[PDB]
Design a protein around this ligand. Structure first.
Ligand SMILES: Nc1ncnc2c1ncn2[C@@H]1O[C@H](COS(=O)(=O)NC(=O)[C@@H](N)Cc2ccc(O)cc2)[C@@H](O)[C@H]1O
Ligand SMILES: Nc1ncnc2c1ncn2[C@@H]1O[C@H](COS(=O)(=O)NC(=O)[C@@H](N)Cc2ccc(O)cc2)[C@@H](O)[C@H]1O
Ligand SMILES: [Mn+2]
Lengths: 266, 785, 159, 157
């Protein structure tokens, strides 16, 4: 006879980090809208993180970002087509550069979504980290309009908070779009707006930087007659309000007691 | 349906080739399963005329004197060998398609047979081998190579879906090809009729069965073999020529999907009566089978005075009596439209499937009868030299088809195309539709032969297939889905994560038929199945499984006999039927267990399975415990129920020994739960940052007490600051009370806002010792470091 | 697909028996009628529509059963994947587009689709389709499709 | 500005572009399924740990570090996991741990790594004494991992 209520062999039970969980749900949501997920490098060149995105040096625009500059030789940074790219190395301050990398390597129309680890030299509080995650979205093609950008975010909201959810766009500035916008989604269960990210219609100069770089590389231009929208949102910010996490600093804390609480969450 | 290229080419003269034809029919909606080249006829085979047929004394053979250019003699045992007919002579030296024994001149029963006369099977044109091919005596100049009048043929094997009964007629097919642009040649029924009364009457006693019924009258018949062109045609279509009259009726049937039968008047008596059979009424059919009729069977009867007799199974098969033989001089030609359901029933009732029942079941042109009469009578006049009456006996008046509203704009909208209006209307007309109105919504009335054209949509399908499906562009739709479609895929996603987690944990998925062996309800000690099959694949599969483990056990056995797995960890998710259809998850563990392959110690059996399950539910974030409960199919010693989030969802335990033994299996552990599993919403709990309190203690308990009961009591009184409660040791013996066991417990306390004072700790460890002993348990160790 | 007609005769159905069995409808109601093992996933096409409102796009995988001989390419128990997209302005071009996407996604850019007319009481136009498998150099007949039949939509709202 | 959704057949070279991403993601899930607990650790490195953990020094350093303990970009993933073990042990006293982390590492070129850690008594009956653990336990899980991934796997000294 056996005491069946007794503890069984202690096999380990794993789990996924909350950021991974949230990233997965976001990617699932945008995959249903036809977006494909691709990643870019964390250590990026000033050209891709800034210049290509219309953010030149010694101007108010640069002063908006808190960049971590790197040093060291022998480091090889490959470009969109495996080429050796040059320029001052840095930690990407956002996922946006992957927006230029993808476009030089592909041809429209397309829909991508790019999650990624980003870095910014700033003070860490309960809603700010120096190391966090963003999700870029980019849809380029003939006839793409801001209504499509609004439609996309509307879908995000519905998918994330149900039918009684809604979105709100307000104008904001980004050297890489025009029109530019910041957006929030209505969280019905919590009764308040959440400022998720920035977006807009890809800037004419960004498309120009892309084809110009394509030419240096010997590729034909590909973005002369197309338009497109792009957005960038905070993964931790969404995870926090979604999984009820009170302090952004927990994410990178490595505390098993914290992590293990998401073994269930998918 | 078989489609002889050259036959179809008679209606569609411009056909490029059998290959292109196949291409054309695919686009029209007709898939050809295969294409064959069929009448290879060697040069050695020539046409011969039988001048005379002499019986060889004392044998059942005949010496045939043939005119095959020069006069030759041949021996034959074929019952139909007789003078006055043409035959297929295989001169010595000929290679017949299927006997590999080069035909030679040989001596038979006293006579030198210079080659031999052929049967359909010997020549390779048909399967019939019981008699010689019978050609018209003058079909060709004696001796001319049969090839010259019987060229090879290519036959396509066409699938003709139920919605196109008009395609069961080569002319129907040709009309479709016509719609594509091909010129169409309809046969002209040149008739030289005579205005005289018909020597018989028609009485349609059951109109429900025969909505439209007609009788033609042909006399002065000279029944004989059909022309070579017609025998070649019928043989290519899988039918066997009989003679003039019969052949014509089959030819026309195949031509315009209109079964028709010729009755020798000798047997009709005063007239034809279409009616139901009387119970038991007998009827010997043409296949030579004596049958008993059902009062539901519609019959073509004849009557004489007060007696009424059946002449054939209406719409299915003709009577053996009324067949047209050579001494037949006049016939009544039946050309009707029968009630599809009735034919269907009857055909089933006698286990028959004929070219006729098949067509009447799928449906027949409600107004093709008279036109078909003209075609058949016309041919009878041309091949049997028939004299034909001008009138027909006709009963029933079918109404023509109604008009169907048609918007060229809706066609383009539904298809996503932009075909110009004119092309759409031109096409519908080529298919025989009448088109009235100036638009935008026309009045289109279809040809009575298209039973499948009733709705505007049907009409647009016409435009699309004639235009060609490949001309329809490619597109992707865009819309915000309606509100109640949101989150509709959570259930599905849930089950799928489960499977993946399981496959991740270490379980191997298995799919097993939903069927169950009614006997296994016994072997596995389960309530019998609630659902059984009225038509099982076999008796071992006559029921719908009520559980998933029986199946997994059997696959274990099967796997063990084929390969000898040393172990196995399986799982299966599937539907089970009992009271209601539900989804289950079952798993199986078998073998030595886990450990170092080379070493000896191992973890396995019951607690191994429970090990994986605990891991599973932890990975799923759900409470999980197993309490002892008896289960017929489980070992009385190792059997318990599974509780997820405090609710009973299934069982876990070892397979009852007796069952394992009856199946010749070593011990097996398993479990089965009901899905979907309970749901517990993430309630994030900010973990305290202060040091925790550690305290150990043992609980002496009578051996029978279940660990879960103790565990529960300890946790209860343990207080609201109990972080962790783990069992690290189980022992029973000295210096413990005989029949007793102790349980080593690791405890932990913690306060969210600050460290805990020993007051709070010890005080709780006490409240525990209180209810602990107040229950009846001893507290061996206490405050143990 | 009404009884005693050529259409029914196309399917090889497994009929069931037994009382006390509760079969719930699209809205949990108790549905009646002769029980059977589904011969295809298509019924889920009517179940979903009575329970929801257009526009929408569903896909429904499922175990189906047919009483027929099992060879190397035929089973009595196999699986199908239904697809249904209903909404204002939906056209056959969208159906072709969908299958085109399936092909591209399944066999790469050098893949292509082929539609030919076929019959199904539940669509009109009706079609059967194949996808070009570039690595194997041959067409694969994947399934049937078409524009949902007017009577199906009528049966749905009537229910 | 109204709401709308775009519709188009994506250009050919955009097909299959998401295989890499999908691959890494299945890996994490399989790992979480096997029994490993995922952990995220800053990409920064303590220049002194190149010594403590006996590794070649970092190739990339920050001109503006958040602090000197974070003045370089990690060249490995295990050092970090070891430190989180220590940290976890001092805060709570886990009796064991099976962790894993997937992340970018920088050295010569930026590359993606997968690291795992086993610590504690091991696996067995909580109340019993015998246990499977240490080296051959970890290798046990790895063998299971690569079998589940359908890949040949061996460890040479
Ligand atoms: N320090 C920090 N810690 C945590 N989350 C942070 C953060 N700094 C920013 N975030 C999150 O990052 C989101 C976007 O960052 S941002 O600096 O405001 N905007 C950007 O970086 C731009 N690349 C956004 C963008 C704008 C337009 C586009 O077409 C594409 C992208 C915010 O909405 C916020 O939720
Ligand atoms: N016995 C069998 N074993 C294995 N696979 C089988 C099978 N019988 C059929 N199949 C597969 O099932 C597919 C479709 O089955 S079918 O009987 O031909 N068509 C149907 O059942 C219809 N429901 C298809 C359909 C048609 C139009 C629609 O709008 C929706 C669905 C086939 O293309 C074939 O690949
Ligand atoms: Mn039709």
């Amino acid at each position: 006879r056996v005491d069946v209520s007794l503890p069984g062999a202690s096999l380990f039970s794993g789990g996924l980090h909350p950021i991974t969980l949230m990233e997965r749900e976001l990617v699932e949501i945008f995959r249903a809208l036809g977006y494909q997920a691709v990643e870019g490098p964390e250590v990026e060149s000033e050209f891709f993180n800034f210049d290509a995105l219309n953010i030149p040096e010694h101007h108010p625009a640069r002063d908006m970002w808190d960049t971590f500059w790197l040093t060291g030789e022998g480091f090889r940074l490959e470009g969109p087509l495996g080429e050796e790219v040059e320029g001052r190395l840095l930690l990407r301050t956002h996922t946006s550069p992957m927006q230029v990398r993808y476009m030089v390597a592909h041809t429209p129309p397309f829909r991508i979504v790019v999650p990624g680890r980003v870095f910014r030299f700033e003070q860490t509080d309960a809603t700010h980290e120096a190391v966090f995650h963003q999700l870029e979205g980019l849809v380029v093609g003939e006839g793409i309009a801001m209504a499509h950008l609004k439609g996309a975010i509307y879908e995000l909201a519905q998918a994330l908070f149900g039918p009684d959810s809604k979105v709100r766009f307000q104008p904001v500035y980004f050297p890489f779009v025009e029109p530019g916008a910041q957006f929030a989604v209505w969280w019905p269960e919590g009764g308040k707006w959440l400022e998720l990210g920035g977006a807009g219609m890809v800037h004419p100069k960004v498309f120009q930087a892309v084809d110009a770089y394509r030419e240096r590389l010997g590729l034909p231009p590909a973005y002369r007659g197309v338009t497109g929208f792009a957005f960038g949102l905070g993964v931790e910010r969404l995870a926090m309000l979604r999984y009820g996490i009170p302090d952004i600093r927990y994410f990178f804390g490595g505390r098993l007691k914290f992590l293990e609480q998401f073994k269930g969450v998918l | 349906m078989r489609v002889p290229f050259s036959w179809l080419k008679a209606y569609v003269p411009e056909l490029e080739s059998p290959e292109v034809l196949e291409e054309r029919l695919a686009g029209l909606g007709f898939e050809t399963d295969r294409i064959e080249r069929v009448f290879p006829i060697p040069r050695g085979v020539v046409f011969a005329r039988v001048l005379e047929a002499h019986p060889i004394p004392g044998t059942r053979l005949k010496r045939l004197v043939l005119d095959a250019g020069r006069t030759v003699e041949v021996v034959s045992g074929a019952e139909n060998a007789r003078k006055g007919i043409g035959v297929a002579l295989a001169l010595p030296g000929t290679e017949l398609p299927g006997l590999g024994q080069k035909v030679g001149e040989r001596v038979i029963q006293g006579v030198r047979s210079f080659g031999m006369a052929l049967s359909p099977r010997e020549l390779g044109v048909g399967e019939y081998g019981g008699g010689l091919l019978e050609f018209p005596e003058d079909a060709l100049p004696p001796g001319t190579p049969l090839s010259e009048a019987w060229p090879e043929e290519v036959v396509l094997d066409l699938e003709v879906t139920p919605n196109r009964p008009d395609a069961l007629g080569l002319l129907g097919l040709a009309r479709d090809l016509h719609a594509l642009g091909y010129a169409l040649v309809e046969p002209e029924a040149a008739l030289k009729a005579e205005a005289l009364p018909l020597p018989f009457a028609l009485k349609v006693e059951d109109p429900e069965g025969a909505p439209h019924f007609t009788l033609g009258y042909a006399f002065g018949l000279r029944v004989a073999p059909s022309p070579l062109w017609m025998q070649r045609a019928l043989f290519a279509a899988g039918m066997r020529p009989i003679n003039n009259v019969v052949d014509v009726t089959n030819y026309v049937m195949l031509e315009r999907a209109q079964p028709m039968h010729a009755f020798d008047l000798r047997f009709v008596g005063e007239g034809i009566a279409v009616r139901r059979a009387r119970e038991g009424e007998r009827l010997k059919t043409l296949d030579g089978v004596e049958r008993t009729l059902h009062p539901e069977d519609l019959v073509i009867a004849g009557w004489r005075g007060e007696e009424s007799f059946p002449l054939g199974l209406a719409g299915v098969m003709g009577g053996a009596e009324s067949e047209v033989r050579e001494d037949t001089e006049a016939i009544a030609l039946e050309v009707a439209c029968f009630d599809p359901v009735s034919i269907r029933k009857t055909a089933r009732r006698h286990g028959l499937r004929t070219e006729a029942s098949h067509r009447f079941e799928r449906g027949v042109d409600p107004l093709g009868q008279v036109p078909a009469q003209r075609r058949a009578l016309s041919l009878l006049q041309a091949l049997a030299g028939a004299r034909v009456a001008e009138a027909l006996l006709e009963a029933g008046s079918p109404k023509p088809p109604e008009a169907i509203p048609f918007r060229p704009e809706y066609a383009n909208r539904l298809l996503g195309t932009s075909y110009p209006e004119a092309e759409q209307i031109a096409i519908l007309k080529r298919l025989g539709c009448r088109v009235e109105g100036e638009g935008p919504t026309y009045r289109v009335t279809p040809p009575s032969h298209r039973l499948d054209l009733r709705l505007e949509e049907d009409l647009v399908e016409e435009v699309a297939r004639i235009q060609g499906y490949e001309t329809i562009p490619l597109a992707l739709p865009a819309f915000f889905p309606a509100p109640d479609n949101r989150g509709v895929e959570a259930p599905y996603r849930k089950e799928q994560r489960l499977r993946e987690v399981l496959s991740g944990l270490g379980f191997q998925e298995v799919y097993t038929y939903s069927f169950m062996d009614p006997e296994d309800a016994r072997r596995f000690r389960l309530d019998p199945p609630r659902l059984l099959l009225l038509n099982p694949l076999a008796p071992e599969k006559a029921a719908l499984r009520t559980h998933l483990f029986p199946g997994l056990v059997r696959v274990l056995k099967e796997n063990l006999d084929l390969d000898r797995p040393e172990r196995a960890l399986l799982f299966e998710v599937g539907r089970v039927f009992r009271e209601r259809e539900e989804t289950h998850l079952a798993g199986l563990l078998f073998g030595e267990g886990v450990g170092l392959p080379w070493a000896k110690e191992r973890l396995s059996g019951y607690f191994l399975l429970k090990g994986y399950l605990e891991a599973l539910f932890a990975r799923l974030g759900l409470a999980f415990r197993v309490e002892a409960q008896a289960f017929p199919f489980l070992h009385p010693g190792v059997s318990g129920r599974v509780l997820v989030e405090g609710e009973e969802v299934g069982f876990l335990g070892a397979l009852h020994p007796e069952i394992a033994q009856e199946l010749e299996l070593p011990p097996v552990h398993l479990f089965e739960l009901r899905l979907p599993l309970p749901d517990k919403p993430l309630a994030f709990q900010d973990p305290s940052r202060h040091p925790a309190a550690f305290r150990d203690l043992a609980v002496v308990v009578p051996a029978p007490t279940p660990y879960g009961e103790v565990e529960a009591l300890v946790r209860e009184a343990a207080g609201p600051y109990l972080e962790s409660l783990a069992l690290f040791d189980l022992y029973q013996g000295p210096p413990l009370p005989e029949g007793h066991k102790s349980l080593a417990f690791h405890l932990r306390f913690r306060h969210p806002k600050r460290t805990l004072r020993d007051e709070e700790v010890e005080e709780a460890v006490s409240r525990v010792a209180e209810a602990l002993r107040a229950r009846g348990f001893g507290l061996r160790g206490l405050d143990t470091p």
